[PDB]
Amino acid sequence: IDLGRVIGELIDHRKLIISITSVFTLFAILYALLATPIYETDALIQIEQSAPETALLQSRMILGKTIDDLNLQIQIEQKYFPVIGRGLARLMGEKPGNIDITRLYLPDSDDISNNTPSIILTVKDKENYSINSDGIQLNGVVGTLLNEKGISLLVNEIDAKPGDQFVITQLPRLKAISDLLKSFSVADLGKDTGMLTLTLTGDNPKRISHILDSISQNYLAQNIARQAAQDAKSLEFLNQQLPGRAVYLQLLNRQQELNIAKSSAIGNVRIIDNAVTDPNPVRPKKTIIIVIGVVLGLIVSVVLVLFQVFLRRGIESPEQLEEIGINVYASIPISEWDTLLAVGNPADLAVEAIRGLRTSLHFAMMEAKNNVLMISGASPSAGMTFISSNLAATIAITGKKVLFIDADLRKGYAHKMFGHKNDKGLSEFLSGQAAAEMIIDKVEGGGFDYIGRGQIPPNPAELLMHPRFEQLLNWASQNYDLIIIDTPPILAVTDAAIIGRYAGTCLLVARFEKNTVKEIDVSMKRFEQSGVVVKGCILNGVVKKASSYYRYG
Amino acid sequence: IDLGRVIGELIDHRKLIISITSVFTLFAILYALLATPIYETDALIQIEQSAPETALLQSRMILGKTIDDLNLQIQIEQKYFPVIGRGLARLMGEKPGNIDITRLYLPDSDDISNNTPSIILTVKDKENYSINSDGIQLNGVVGTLLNEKGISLLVNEIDAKPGDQFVITQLPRLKAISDLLKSFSVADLGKDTGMLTLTLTGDNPKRISHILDSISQNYLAQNIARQAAQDAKSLEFLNQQLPKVRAELDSAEDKLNAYRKLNMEAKSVLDQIVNVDNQLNELTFREAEVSQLYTKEHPTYKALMEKRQTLQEEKSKLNKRVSSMPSTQQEVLRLSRDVESGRAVYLQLLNRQQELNIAKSSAIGNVRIIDNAVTDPNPVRPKKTIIIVIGVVLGLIVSVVLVLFQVFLRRGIESPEQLEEIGINVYASIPISEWDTLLAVGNPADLAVEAIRGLRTSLHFAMMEAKNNVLMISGASPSAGMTFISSNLAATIAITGKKVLFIDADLRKGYAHKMFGHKNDKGLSEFLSGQAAAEMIIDKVEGGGFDYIGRGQIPPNPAELLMHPRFEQLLNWASQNYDLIIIDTPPILAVTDAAIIGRYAGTCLLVARFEKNTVKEIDVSMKRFEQSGVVVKGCILNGVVKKASSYYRYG
């Protein structure tokens, strides 16, 4: 988990980390390149406070008048069936479609849920067109308004590209106020200065400048009217109250004074510069989301690689076994590769490591009480038979006479690998229906005498206790130089602990990353409880990244 | 990780550190001497608050007037094909080129992406020149304006150096405002005082002083428009003029609708005439103010009449072009001219009424300018000695982060103490020799040979009372130098006067016979196979003076051969007919041959390259030897660099 270790798995898992980081950066790039650009237009408004104005501008009375002025409740969208069709259309350089509806009156379904009657325009040419509401396509031409089925549409200056689809939505006036208010914004930048920076954000650049200009003009006219409104109320009641002729002339003087005061009311507010749009979009923010795509890829890569590191529990190195006190006698590398590897490809690394195991056994197996070696896998799929068969081959070619007993009376398949006469295996001997001679075979390849399990018996453990097994071992240990026995796992059955009573040396075989240290420890303890002393372990299937063996020659 | 050998390996990698810090400082030197200098000019403006003015000056109204005043939307640069041509041209002292365009009209491509049409001026002489837009080079002279292909250009007082290239960009008004505003800056420095320090930063010195003066004088003229506007008839003139202009606007759009209810040159000349008419209007109403604010002999007013005589020439040429094309186009062109000319005048008048009203509600009185803008001769950017020191520390920090990274990169042995911590008797530290014959007989006084003699003495002490006189030397890896050490050691022991036999039991890829001169037939493998006799395989290295046994042919079963009892017989015979027997074996991390021969060796040694083989390889090799019943006596470090070896010449 240390830094050196960390860069270790990172380069080891470089494919994974760079793949996921690249795919997230690819997603970030496509989103940055497909998200519709959103422009921002500004205006400068001058007064002589500004705290009421920043809320009076955002009032529905101001915005709603622009809505009714620019017909903004008539929404227009070029249709793209994909969620990204518009983006790619812009990417291809295709000029976006747009029309002008000066007057829309839908059938006004205006239901509680679908209060937005949505209609689609099918552009036939630059003059005529067809509109489908729910399938009923009404053909119409710019100029003449279509007034049928309660649908009054006056669309003019339709775009060029025919066959396109335009979604029309007569969303309610309140909605057309609320969205605009969401995009609209105001600020002061002086905290007392008359300066107001109206800012509007939208996709259509030419449209938003016009919208903000309309807002500014509506606010200007509103301020002109409002200051005049007080004088207008006074004037209205004077007009209502005109009947005392000297008082009448005084009232006439007041009447003319209020006429001039109301008419000449000039708003304090001032439009310093009309709205213009910044050509550079402010959203989507390029180079700010792509880097977030990068760092998101890296952080998720780290959190998943660490999770996978804390996911596996298998043996990682012979040092883990040796910490518990288990003499790892070998670390057989996993070979890429029906005959024995030791005779098929005698120069393969997994065979050089089995020769290395042969020497260490030959040293460790002297002083043993007899020449019987028991090899027990820690589990099925631990390759106990791979190791035992290849070891018997690599010892046979040496020149010793080797007998290879497959005492896995449950699911042994050595006979399925060496070529066999399935009759008269081992079980047929312990049952007493076969003699010691007709059961032994000759593997022509390995050059070692081989005994198969034979037919699966119903009582394996009960068979192995029969004293004929010890007779067989006593006879063989006299007629052979080495006896290898394959036994079932001790964590599954008890056959291993029955055979081990007669074995001079016992070894466990552990797949590299499948079997855990817990299984090896428990298996050796359970062998000890049965009076069988496990000499050591044989790590198997170690990946070539972790194995020290390499080709030489 | 401690100061002592921190300074140590920094003295070691001094070459690297000064190399890269110097590279970065040269990068900084070239950046500082190639970055275009930027000058800033400050002007001081006096009023009697000023918080509104800090944002009113930076409004598009005031800046937008200066842009239209100095034609700042016409951008010009000397063209340099490299990114640093301008800087190097300055470094040579070449006076930068500059020309003057009082009237530019590009073909107005103005696309969505390339909204800035670009042309290049090729300077032919001090008088004439040629301009290529996209290949069509139009030859022109100062004075006369070039009005061809919808392109109107009036350039005058062009620089001297001929053959140069001037890129011209008619960037839009908004861009020409935004860049200026980015460069422009205002402050107050009193938080209430009437002092407004204006600052403008740019490259061309005389450029920015004029721009700042124009800004200041526009603001002054606006606040004088205060004092003159209230009684001015212009207010009522605009009040009455707007309705009639909007009336003809309405009439013109009605005419368009009536005639509506695409020849390229038609649009080109239409846009050109409209631009000309807008400029003619704005210049008339501009003359309206320069006439009483300034005098006729004042050069600014002369500039107004000159640029309009240019514009009237341009309109004359445009009308000449209009007359020549078909009436089907002339009708539409006149109808569109009336229309968009009406909108242009209408927009102007709206503006006109607007800032004329700005005179009214401005409560400022006198807006005296204290001192006109002058540019500081010293450039403020690029900052000298403030990127250079950053170049220094950047090189230094990248040096430390790279050197420490390389420190934590290598994992090999670094000193015999690393092995002796594990408990390995390092018998020697053979230093690397600069140097086909044996080094022990080629260059007998080389340091590596003296260290090998030292190994000879240490062995001769440690090799006695071993069970026999066979020595097995096993490399920790291929390319650990096993055969170098073994061969030279055998030579150094043979010259002493002992009979030495050198068995190359590296049956897999042994090559000693390729180095001693050999009869390749009947090596060692041919003996284990039983097809050769014990005496027929032994040789004589004439140089070293020791008997040599080569591997012979590579057999298919090495480890199976080495177990044959003939190997036992051979060693038993030789150890009786020789004083010392050296055996070369393959690594034990790769094959099991070493653990087969170590069955019979009195002494076994590992050879480890200095920085290649790690401590783990030696530890694993010794433990795997022990598993096989072979006790490794110790190690022999090899190829240690002369910086870390204690050996030195003597004599």
- Asked if A499 and A407 count as a contact pair (C-beta separation under 8 A), the reply is yes
Where in B360-469 does DSSP place strands (E)?
A: 369-375, 426-431
Q: Are B601 and B630 in contact (CB under 8 A)?
A: yes
| Residues contacting A381, CB < 8 A, separation 6+ | A511, A514
What residues of chain B lie within 8 A of the CB of A358, using their CB? 592
**Residue count of chain B:** 651
Q: Which of B251, B231, B233 is nearest to B241 (CA)?
A: B233
* CA B79-B80-B86 angle, 5° bins: 105
Does the distance separating the beta carbons of A553 and B509 come in below 8 Å? Answer: yes
Q: What secondary structure does DSSP assign to A286-340, as a single string?
A: TTTSHHHHHHHHHHHHHHHHHHHHTT--S---HHHHHHHT--EEEEEEPP-----
Tokens of A142: 């710019």
* 3-class DSSP state of A10: helix
Report how far residue A490's alpha carbon sits from residue A496's, in angstroms, rounded to the nearest whole number.
6
Q: Which residues touch A350 (CB under 8 Å, ≥6 apart)?
A: A332, A333, A334, A335, A341, A390
Interatomic CA distance for residues A342 and A445, integer angstroms: 9
B61 contact residues in A (CB cutoff 8 A): 272-273
Measured at the CA of B5, the angle between CA B1 and CA B6, to 5 degrees, comes to: 65
Query: Tokens representing B225?
Result: 């428009």
Instruction: Map residue B231 onto helix, strand or coil.
Output: coil
- Distance, CA of B37 to CA of B378 (rounded, Å): 9
Q: Which residues contact B614 (CB under 8 A, 6 or more apart)?
A: B411, B412, B413
Q: Any CB–CB contact under 8 A between A552 and chain B?
A: yes
Question: What backbone phi and psi angles, to 5 degrees, belong to A187?
Answer: -150, 170
- Joined tokens for residue B118: 């670009």
**Cis status of the peptide bond prior to B587, with omega within 30 of 0:** no
Please enumerate in sequence order all residues whose Cβ is within 8 A of that of B138, keeping only pairs 6 or more positions apart, or say none: B130, B131, B132, B146, B148, B149, B151
| Angle CA A403–A406–A409, to nearest 5 | 150
Determine the Cα–Cα distance for residues B450 and B648; give it in Å rounded to an integer: 10
Tell me if B193 sits within 8 A of B136, measured CB to CB. Answer: no
Residue type, B624: R
Distance CA A160, CA A162 (A): 6
- Fill in the amino acid letter for B573: W
State whether residue A363 sits within 8 Å of chain B by CB.
yes
Closest Cβ opposite residue A552 in set B586, B595, B620: B586
CA distance A219 to A56: 9
- Among the listed residues A366, A362, A452, the one whose alpha carbon sits nearest the alpha carbon of residue A403: A452
Chain B: residue whose CA lies nearest to A318: B620
* CA pair distance B420, B333, nearest whole angstrom: 100
Distance from CA of B584 to the nearest CA of A (A): 15
Contacts of B590 in chain A (CB under 8 A): 352, 549-552
- Alpha-carbon dihedral sign for residues A374, A377, A380, A383: negative
Dist. CA A474–CA B73, nearest whole Å:
108
Q: For strand A372-377 and strand A505-511, is the pairing parallel, antiparallel, or unpaired?
A: parallel
Contacts for A429 with CB less than 8 Å, ≥ 6 apart: A435, A436, A439, A454, A468, A472
Q: What's the rounded Cα separation, in Å, for the pair B534 and B525? A: 11
Judge: A189–B55 Cβ closer than 8 Å, yes or no: yes
Strand partners, A39: A202
Q: How far apart (Å, rounded) are the C-alpha atoms in residues A280 and B465?
A: 90
Judge residue B163's burial from the number of C-beta atoms within 10 Å of its C-beta, 0-12 exposed, 13-18 middle, 19 or more buried. exposed
Grouping H, G, I as helix, E, B as strand and the rest as coil, residue B614 is coil
Taking alpha carbons only, the member of B538, B460, B539, B448 closest to residue B497 is B460
Cβ B79 vs Cβ B168: under 8 Å: no
Pairing state between β B75-78 and B165-169: antiparallel
> Hey, how many other C-beta atoms are within 10 angstroms of the C-beta on A364?
19
On whether any CB of chain A is under 8 Å from the CB of B627, the answer is yes
**Cβ of residue A549 closer than 8 Å to a chain B Cβ:** yes
Helices (DSSP H) in B496-557: which residue ranges? 513-516, 525-528
Choose from A39, A223, A273, A274 for mutation: most chain B CBs within 10 A: A273
Residue A206 burial (CB count, 10 A): 12
Residue ranges of E strands in A229-319 = 270-283
Reading the block at residue B227, the tokens are 């004092």
Picking from B494, B562, B492, the residue whose alpha carbon sits closest to that of residue B527 is: B562
DSSP conformational letter for A60:
H
| Integer Cα distance of B519 and B511 in angstroms | 12
Contact A155, A121 (CB under 8 A): yes
Q: For residue A380, say if its preceding peptide bond is cis, omega within 30 degrees of 0.
A: no
Query: For residue B495, what is the DSSP state?
Result: T
The SS3 of residue B25 is helix
Mutual angle of helices B327-360 and B264-293, in 10-degree steps: 30
Beta bridge partners, B580, equal B500
Nearest CB to B59 within list A44, A143, A268: A44
Q: CA B548, B553, B559: angle at the middle one, nearest 5?
A: 90
Pairing outcome for strands A372-377 and A482-487: parallel
In angstroms, rounded to a whole number, what is the distance separating the alpha carbons of residues A417 and B538?
46
Q: Which residues contact A189 (CB under 8 A, 6 or more apart)?
A: A195, A197, B55
CA A422 to centroid of chain Cα atoms: 52
DSSP string, A469-518: HHHHHHHHHHH-SEEEEEE--TTT-SHHHHHGGG-SEEEEEEESSSS-HH
Quote the strand ranges of B171-284, DSSP E: 184-187, 195-202
Q: What is the DSSP string of A43-90?
A: EEEE----TTHHHHTTSHHHHHHHHHHHTTTEEEEE--SSTTHHHHHH
Residues paired with residue A485 on neighbouring β-strands, in sequence order? A374, A405
Q: What are phi and psi of B605, to 5 degrees?
A: -130, 145
| Interface membership of B228 toward A (CB under 8 Å) | no
- Give A95→chain B minimum CA distance, Å: 10
| Burial (CB count within 10 angstroms: exposed 0-12, middle 13-18, buried 19+), residue A247 | exposed
- Nearest Cα to Cα of residue A29 among A91, A93, A94, A92: A91
Total Cβ atoms within 10 A of residue B140: 22
Q: Looking at the complex, does the CB of residue B406 fall below 8 Å from at least one CB of chain A?
A: no
**If DSSP codes are grouped into helix, strand and coil, which group holds residue B258?**
helix
Strand order in the sheet with A118-123: A74-78, A165-170, A118-123, A128-132, A137-141
SS3 content of chain A, % helix, strand, coil (to 5): 40, 20, 40
Tokens representing residue A441 in the block: 């075979």
Amino acid at B326: P
The C-alpha atoms of residue A267 and residue A547 are separated, in whole angstroms, by 87
Task: Judge whether B624 and B588 are in contact, CB under 8 Å.
Answer: yes
First to last CA, chain A: 36
Q: What is the resolution of this structure in A?
A: 3.5
Find the distance separating the first CA and the last CA of chain B, reported in whole Å: 38
8 A C-beta contact, residue A123 and residue A162 = yes
Structure tokens at B39: 């000058």
The DSSP code for A63 is H
- CB atoms inside a 10 Å sphere around CB B423: 9
Q: What are the C-alpha distances in Å from B569 to residues A431, B473, B564, B574?
A: 49, 20, 9, 9
Residue A66 φ/ψ, nearest 5 degrees:
-65, -35
Q: Which of B558, B582, B566, B507 is nearest to B532 (CA)?
A: B566
Q: Name the strand (E) or helix (H) holding B637.
A: strand B634-640
Sign of CA dihedral B447, B453, B457, B458: positive
- What is B47-92 written as a DSSP string? ----HHHHHHTTSHHHHHHHHHHHTTT-EEEE--SSTTHHHHHHHT
What's the maximum distance between 2 C-alpha atoms anywhere in chain B?
134
Cα angle, residue B496 at apex, residues B491 and B499 outer, rounded to 5°: 70
- Rounded to whole angstroms, the Cα distance separating B463 from B456 reads 10
Dihedral, CA of residue B343, residue B344, residue B349 and residue B354, to nearest 10: 100
Backbone angles phi and psi of B152, in degrees to 5: -115, 120
Got the DSSP string for A88-145? HHHHTTPPPP--EEEEEE------SS--S-EEEEEE-SSSEEEEESSS-EEEEESSS-
**Distance (Å, whole) CA A89 – CA A80:** 9
Q: Is B617 exposed, middle or buried (0-12, 13-18, 19+ CB in 10 A)?
A: buried
Q: Residue A147 in contact with residue A38, Cβ under 8 Å? A: no
Tokens of B358: 């700005």
Q: Which residues of A touch B60 (CB under 8 A)?
A: 44, 272-273, 276
Taking alpha carbons only, the member of A67, A47, A22, A13 closest to residue A296 is A22
H helices, E strands: number in chain B:
22, 19
A6 to chain B nearest CA, in Å?
13
| Nearest-CB residue to B52 (from A195, A273, A397) | A195
| C-alpha triplet A442, A447, A448: angle, nearest 5° | 65
**Amino acid in the structure at residue B509:** K
Per the document, the length of chain A is: 553
* Element (DSSP H or E) covering residue B23: helix B14-34
Helix (H, G, I), strand (E, B) or coil at A150: coil
Torsion angles phi and psi, residue A535, rounded to 5: -65, -45
Question: What is the C-alpha to C-alpha distance for residues B379 and B212, in angstroms, rounded to an integer?
Answer: 17
